[PDB]
Ligand binder design. Structure first.
Ligand SMILES: CCCCCCCCCCCCCCCC(=O)O
Ligand SMILES: CCCCCCCCCCCCCCCC(=O)O
Lengths: 256, 55, 238, 273, 238, 273, 125, 55
């Protein structure tokens, strides 16, 4: 009596369950862990809130419509206003984390579709107008998804994002996003997607506002579809849990 | 003190570093390590090929 | 003064040479290394990772997610072809821009088996069996199911296990094949057929999609490093 | 096998069990590990093919011209200047961008060539040209004229070359301020999320300056300096999709939406059309 | 004649090269060495020695001893800022010409903690407590005492021990910082405040001065040798 | 640690004793030895940073152009002459003056370049130029003309170079008459405290002379000779404040009073203004 | 060379110094410490911010005038808006702490006065 | 008789002096000695950090 379809994850005062998941993808094989003394530079005693910061934060849901192109969330950012994890970002110059990203989305034996849940590290995005760079307000959606576009975005001295889905706003083949830790929610067999991401970056720690080392993207390759009778509102919810969060350089708050 | 490695084939060669900085050394063209697992197969629960991926 | 004698090649500058050269930063203390997840040692590590193939190049679809969708639906017959592309991991537009293909395009020769994983994205209630086949060159691409099954094939039955693999065994007269196109180096034809048509119940969509992933096997290798045709420019970017 | 050899093909025979190598579930995010023998009778093959030319090192280790400008004997532009960057050339840049972070030493090579400019000067008799390339790390005095005191280079590193001789060359250590060069940076330079955005907020590799040391002839001469990069002792992390859309700007990833691939007739056409 | 083959770089002249070269004075007998006090082995030996910082750049004062004076006096309140400069040992005019700063300006990168020693030059009868603080970047420079105390700080109480130290711990996202200016490499803000205002008796001057010394800690280092911007010329001196 | 490594950061915790690392007394002349952990809880940090590039040797060991003059094919100045000194260039001079006394060997490098002068001579056909640099130690016969017997150099050391070849180079021993070169000399040359004053009373390094060996062409040519110094095997004593005021004269420390630093608004302005 | 007049306290990224203190009074002899497992009830994993929360927070100064009667501050409260210590109070139902209370006030050999610094537990008013 | 030292890193190199004068040898770029005391701390009576500088 054991099925890999079932699973349960506990982190802090929060637990998640699935009865129809795939496996669980673990980063680049690496499992999150605090910073070793032989790999640090910040000389001050770090802070490890632990249970207070490394828990499951459930973001705003999103509707998957027969035509939705996709969504995305910058990671250090998507939680910058949730609980003490956010409070620690505001109060500290330096931060370091990994996350257990859990994307939920149930349908029924009668619906169909296939999402691609992926964690893209260092997802720098392009601009609609080749002479500028997207603005913060256009890139960051903090706890509320950012939508990809079904077709190109016009130029014209604006600071918009080239949200064309098949280009992942990075100017690359969207179908090659698999070289990144990922899973596929194929309503037919799947029902949720879990990915544990280890801290990634070219430095031991970084400022959590000024930089977004990972970007979560959900992108349907096979559009939702059902039949008259089957329910029409199929939401997609994202829950993310920080792991081994450390903060250095304490000072006055504010994300200025 | 020189070193002596193997050349590429289907024999050896001698090397003596002449500079005080490792940056000056020739390329490391013979590191044939390989670890696909990190990318293909980063699953937490080992998946046995002959078995069903779901049950 | 040790009697010496320069030989041909002296003073030249080979782009792929390999010599020692004085550091411009004597005794510079490099930044200590750090454990960064996912290091890469060989490009083949990447070529072994599945990436979604755009089987549906057809017209304007190349500018939408549809390029990655393989149309399957209930018919009033079986034997119907579902798709068909050649084994030109490097040249064929179907593969050329894949993870595997991108890499191949930086080399001149390739060798090894290839894996085509097919995921059925229909609905839980949808069923059916397909015939994934690979026909080595020599004759033409099979035009009927009854002629494709005469070659290397896998009868995939859709069920709880969503995906199914068609391992394209490296059959060839030479050890390596050209990444570029060449008939000597012909690789054969990969085709799919309906074994037993899609069969859904009422209230369940009868038109579905099948995704196709491609990746290299453990016996895959690439030779003769070259530049990609896929990237160009007219002037240094500003 | 042989350190870099490839897997040998294991001979297989007829099967009829409940072992399902061929059936899997891509949703897991796991790539199948199937091999020929799993879905067809195979023979045994001792494979000697090596993956030697696919090592990160062999892939990025070839000199690449990343940029080039010119400066003249006399006139307005008598000395050249270039803010160091690997993103103005598309060739090398697309390779490096195959990975998110990278670390390597660099072999620098310079190809310096001169060409006589058309003029009306009588009896021109050029002497051999001697050039001077000089590197100015961020924060150092810059030359404002071909005879500025700055070309003293008491501390700045600089090479002196003379036409005819082999291309000047020199090694450069991994100069990052961090634990690895970053190829992408989804962040800003300001904590307010203003100022600069993207890779260019990290680029502070200083500037390169070239000039003649002597004018040579009475006539006018123009010299071109080609800068080549060659990564050595490479270490790369987190591979990413290769660049699809052509490059647009040098200081950001801005692109012009492109199709996923070239097209063809129908999903049945065995031809590239 | 030993077959040889010159490689790129041959015959060039790198300013930072390191080769052997024939002596023009064959067998010259150097003058025997002698024990001279205070030998120097590394520049950091110097950068560890305190030097008086000119916190008061304000206007014309740069042309007098006043540049090195920090005004402190009895007020009708507390919380008053006493000074505030950034952590840019290389760039900021406050440090740039210091012993530490002079050295930094011959390099491109720096790393390590820094010591700011504050000597109270008031009168024996003068008293008071100050709040020396260091706020890492990310937010703005603290504008009120109540916001500076939220960061790394030392409440200095003036007494028989004249001086007090504010050790500025090297907090940073990278191992090294640029000596030149750059916001990525931002270092934060160093500010001082009145904890409990100056309190003298009668017949004792109520307006005083505080000197500030700066020096490097034992974990300080510098990289990438370059030329100083601080010295220039137009023609060879005669 | 590793010979040149830097101190590691010792992890510390909460304190509440009468130990006062932070309180000291600068009057002693002693610099505080406080470290992060003394005034704040620290973590432990294994620091691998090296101080390799700060050694007196690495700091003064880079070729530096200390001077350069020219001499012509024909005409008035057919040969050059230079009283040897490191104080005509400001770059290297400011570094050496970082210390009171210094001792080192010297690597000499010469960059010799020629340029054709504008004239009205028909059919000019220059032959390859060959130069001759010659050193004349204090007390030796000096050349009065490009064809003086003095260029025989039976004993004087001199190099012969030909355009096209690598820069001529040679090593020079520590030539002081004393136990170390003096960078400063608060004294006179006369016991009456008259005559010369300052560093120049010690400078008696002789003179350098350059010239062509052949005229080459019928046309007029001007040649520039750049002299580079590179201290090797350095030993320095008694560090001093770095030069603040620009250099004025080459034979003394004369300066034009300068402000202590650049200015800024108020002692509260976090900006360089 | 040692004087009990001098002292220095370090807690987190903050240090305090005095050159004229008395001794240091330690609670009821007890020194602060986390809650032992045999003395707890709250079953969840607690959070110990440590350096981020246990640091020196300097409040608003106050003027001592020839007639000032005195001042007072409720403790859990006086810091409820300072840094992460406050943020943790807002986000959590339960909290537990001890404090190093340091009251500063210098004058001069010529002034005079005597304050009474006291920590009153459970000061219902 | 050559010598063999260590290069700078985060391997060795061979050196053979070819000239009769030590002046001709390459620079001594690897002398990492350090003695700050001469400058920072030239006090006659040892000052113990944790103690008061005056009493
Ligand atoms: C004459 C001395 C020349 C020295 C040449 C120094 C060139 C520096 C090269 C830096 C390399 C590639 C780095 C990209 C930087 C970034 O984006 O972070
Ligand atoms: C062709 C032979 C050339 C020999 C070059 C000799 C140059 C002598 C260099 C003396 C060095 C620096 C000394 C400053 C002298 C002083 O002020 O005491």
């Amino acid at each position: 009596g054991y099925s890999d379809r079932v699973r349960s994850i506990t982190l802090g005062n929060s637990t998640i369950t699935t009865q129809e998941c795939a496996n669980v993808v673990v980063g680049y094989g690496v499992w999150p862990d605090y910073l070793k003394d032989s790999e640090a530079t910040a000389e001050d005693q770090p802070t490890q809130p632990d249970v207070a910061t490394c828990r499951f934060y459930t973001l705003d849901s999103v509707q998957w419509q027969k035509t939705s192109p996709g969504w995305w969330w910058k990671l250090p950012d998507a939680l910058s206003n949730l609980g003490l994890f956010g409070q620690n970002m505001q109060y500290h110059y330096l931060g370091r984390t990994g996350y257990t990203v859990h994307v939920q989305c149930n349908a029924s034996k009668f619906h169909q579709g296939c999402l691609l849940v992926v964690c893209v590290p260092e997802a720098e995005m392009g601009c609609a107008t080749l002479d500028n760079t997207p603005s913060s307000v256009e890139l960051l959606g903090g706890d509320s998804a950012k939508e990809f576009a079904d077709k190109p975005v016009a130029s014209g001295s604006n600071k918009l994002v080239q949200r064309v889905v098949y280009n992942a706003g990075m100017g690359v083949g969207v179908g090659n996003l698999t070289i990144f830790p990922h899973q596929w929610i194929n309503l037919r067999t799947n029902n949720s997607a879990t990915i544990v991401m280890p801290y990634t970056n070219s430095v031991p720690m970084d400022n959590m506002f000024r930089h977004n080392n990972v970007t979560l993207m959900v992108i349907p390759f096979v559009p939702l579809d059902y039949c008259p009778g089957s329910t029409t509102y199929v939401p997609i919810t994202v829950t993310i849990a920080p792991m081994c969060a450390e903060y250095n350089g304490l000072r006055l708050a504010g994300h200025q | 003190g020189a070193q002596v490695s193997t050349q590429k084939t289907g024999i050896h060669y001698t090397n003596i570093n002449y500079y005080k900085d490792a940056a000056s050394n020739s390329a490391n063209r013979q590191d044939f390590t390989q670890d696909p697992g990190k990318f293909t197969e980063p699953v937490k629960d080992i998946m046995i090929k002959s078995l069903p991926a779901l049950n | 003064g040790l009697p010496t004698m320069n030989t041909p090649g002296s003073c030249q500058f080979l782009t792929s040479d390999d010599f020692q050269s004085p550091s411009a930063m004597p005794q510079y203390d490099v930044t200590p290394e750090m454990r960064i997840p996912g290091e890469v040692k060989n490009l083949m590590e990447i070529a072994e990772v599945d990436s979604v193939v755009p089987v549906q190049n057809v017209g304007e679809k190349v500018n939408s997610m549809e390029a990655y969708q393989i149309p399957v639906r209930s018919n009033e017959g079986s034997g119907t072809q579902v798709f068909g592309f050649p084994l030109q991991p490097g040249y064929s537009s179907v593969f050329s821009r894949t993870l595997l293909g991108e890499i191949l395009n930086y080399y001149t020769h390739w060798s090894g088996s290839i894996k085509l994983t097919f995921m059925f994205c229909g609905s839980a209630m949808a069923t059916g069996k397909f015939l994934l086949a690979y026909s080595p060159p020599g004759a033409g691409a099979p035009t009927k199911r009854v002629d494709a099954m005469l070659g290397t094939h896998v009868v995939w039955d859709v069920g709880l296990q969503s995906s199914c693999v068609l391992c394209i065994p490296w059959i060839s007269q030479t050890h390596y094949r050209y990444v570029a196109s060449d008939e000597y180096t012909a690789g054969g034809f990969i085709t799919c057929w309906y074994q037993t048509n899609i069969v859904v119940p009422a209230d369940a969509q009868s038109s579905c999609y099948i995704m196709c992933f491609v990746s290299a096997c453990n016996d895959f290798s690439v030779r003769l490093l070259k530049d990609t045709p896929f990237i160009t420019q007219q002037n240094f970017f500003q | 096998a042989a350190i870099g050899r490839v897997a040998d093909t294991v001979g297989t025979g007829p099967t009829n069990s409940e072992a399902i190598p061929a059936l899997t579930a891509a949703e897991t995010g796991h790539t199948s590990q199937v091999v020929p023998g799993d879905t067809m009778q195979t023979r045994h093959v001792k494979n000697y093919h090596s993956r030697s030319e696919s090592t990160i090192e062999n892939f990025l280790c070839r000199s690449a011209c990343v940029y080039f400008t010119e400066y003249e004997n006399s006139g307005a532009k008598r000395y050249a200047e270039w803010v160091i960057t690997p993103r103005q050339a598309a060739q090398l840049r697309r390779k490096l961008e195959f990975f998110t972070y990278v670390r390597f030493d660099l072999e620098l090579t310079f190809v310096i060539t001169s060409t006589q400019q058309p003029s009306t000067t009588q009896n021109q008799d050029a002497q051999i040209l001697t050039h001077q390339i000089m590197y100015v790390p961020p924060g150092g005095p810059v030359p404002d004229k071909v005879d500025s005191y700055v070309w003293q280079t008491s501390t700045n590193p600089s090479v002196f070359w003379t036409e005819g001789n082999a291309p000047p060359r020199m090694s450069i250590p991994f100069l990052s301020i961090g634990n690895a060069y970053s190829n992408f940076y989804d962040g800003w330079s300001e904590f307010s999320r203003n100022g600069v955005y993207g890779i260019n907020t990290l680029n502070n590799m200083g500037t390169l300056y070239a000039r003649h040391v002597n004018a040579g002839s009475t006539g006018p001469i123009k010299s071109t300096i080609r800068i080549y990069f060659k990564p050595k002792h490479v270490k790369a992390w987190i591979p990413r999709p290769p660049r699809l859309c052509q490059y647009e700007k040098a200081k950001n990833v801005n692109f012009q939406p492109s199709g996923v691939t070239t097209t063809r007739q129908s999903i049945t056409t065995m031809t590239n059309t």
